Design a protein around this ligand. Structure first.
Ligand SMILES: O=C(O)[C@@]1(O)C[C@@H](O)[C@@H](O)[C@@H]([C@H](O)CO)O1
Ligand SMILES: [Mg+2]
Ligand SMILES: [Mg+2]
Lengths: 112, 121
């Protein structure tokens, strides 16, 4: 039962501010073979379908803005939004794909 | 253009069953896995399972919370995906998303807009 714990539950910044959010895992999503971490971040605007943001912990999914930085390895990961855009209002899910798939609880981003 | 299209969802009586459709286009269906992700109103996303690609022989996996209840299979001739829900509870009342998946990125790269399933008498 690999469990990812996201903090905060939510947070409210202004447009342009600097936001970071954390993801603690039950188990090291570090695969030794390929030497990658099996974590991914998704974006879900309110009332919309999710949308891949970052995979293997740090790789930005094509089309994704420089703003979004994935970081970490093993059982500790984060997501930074350098200079938030209004576009960014959503819930952010981390999801382990080390063994099957397991969604985190999500961080709800507010914009002032 | 990649397209995923969920359908078949409505209102279901408790204890019952409904079948979901996932129709796709804009990529070579059989090379990828396909997952089913759901979301109850105001709650988090929960992965339900996936069906592997050709390479893997299109085998099946599920999460522990629906194993034995739910059933994943694929129409490779039509590039269509399916989910069989059974013994339904209100805890299955949700929006159901099909998502492109696999070991290339080990993440779900393309999603549909979803389908709502509401369990109630
Ligand atoms: O179950 C799979 O076929 C799969 O390859 C999916 C990958 O994303 C990853 O979960 C992998 C596991 O890491 C096992 O190696 O399993
Ligand atoms: Mg790609
Ligand atoms: Mg702008």
């Amino acid at each position: 039962d690999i469990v990812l714990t996201q903090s905060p539950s939510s947070l409210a910044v202004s447009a342009g501010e600097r936001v970071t959010m954390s993801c603690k895992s039950s188990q090291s999503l570090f695969k030794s073979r390929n030497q990658k971490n099996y974590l991914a971040w998704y974006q879900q605007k309110p009332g919309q379908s999710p949308k891949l943001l970052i995979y293997w912990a740090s790789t930005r999914e094509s089309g994704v803005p420089d703003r979004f930085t994935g970081s970490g390895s093993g059982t500790d990961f984060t997501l930074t939004i350098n200079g938030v855009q209004a576009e960014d209002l959503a819930v952010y899910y981390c999801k382990q794909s080390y063994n099957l798939r397991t969604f985190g609880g999500g961080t709800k981003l507010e914009l002032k | 253009e990649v397209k995923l299209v969920e359908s078949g969802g409505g209102l279901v009586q408790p204890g019952g069953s409904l079948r979901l459709s996932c129709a796709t286009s804009g990529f070579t269906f059989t090379d990828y896995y396909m997952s089913w992700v759901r979301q109850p109103p105001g709650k988090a996303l929960e992965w339900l399972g996936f069906i592997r690609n050709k390479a893997k022989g299109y085998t099946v996996e599920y999460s522990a919370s629906v194993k034995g209840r739910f059933t994943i299979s694929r129409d490779n001739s039509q590039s269509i995906l399916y989910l069989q829900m059974n013994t339904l509870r209100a805890e299955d009342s949700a929006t159901y998303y099909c998502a492109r998946d696999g070991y290339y990125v080990d993440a779900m790269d393309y999603w549909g807009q979803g389908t709502s399933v509401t369990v109630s008498s």
